[PDB]
Design a protein around this ligand. Sequence first.
Ligand SMILES: Cc1c(NCc2ccccc2-c2ccccc2)cnn(C)c1=O
Length: 127
Amino acid sequence: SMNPPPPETSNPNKPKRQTNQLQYLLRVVLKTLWKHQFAWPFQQPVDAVKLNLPDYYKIIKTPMDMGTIKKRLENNYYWNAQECIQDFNTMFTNCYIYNKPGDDIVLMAEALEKLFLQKINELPTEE
Ligand SMILES: Cc1c(NCc2ccccc2-c2ccccc2)cnn(C)c1=O
């Protein structure tokens, strides 16, 4: 069994910025979700070998996880907040597409998404 390489977290030729909106996405949004009791399944890429999910990467073609998002925020990978917000939404959507309603992993994603939506609702205006 085989995992794909993780998503890119470093690219010297990709343009990037340090902005108050991206600082908020690390300091408020990522920090809030990361410390949550249901964060652990989302803190690293889905390991299809260890989890015995040989079909995972047949169904999910844009993998994303909070470990990758945390690295992208800490290593200033992003140009804007929308790029980072899309990564969170990709992570949640992948969970809902692969799994079934009421599955433990879906209940965990739903709890994290509720907090995500609450925090993004108060995304500050650009300075
Ligand atoms: C389908 C799927 C996963 N499957 C396993 C799982 C399921 C529920 C809770 C926890 C884990 C887990 C987490 C880490 C290690 C071992 C099991 C796990 N994560 N995601 C995002 C999934 O979609």
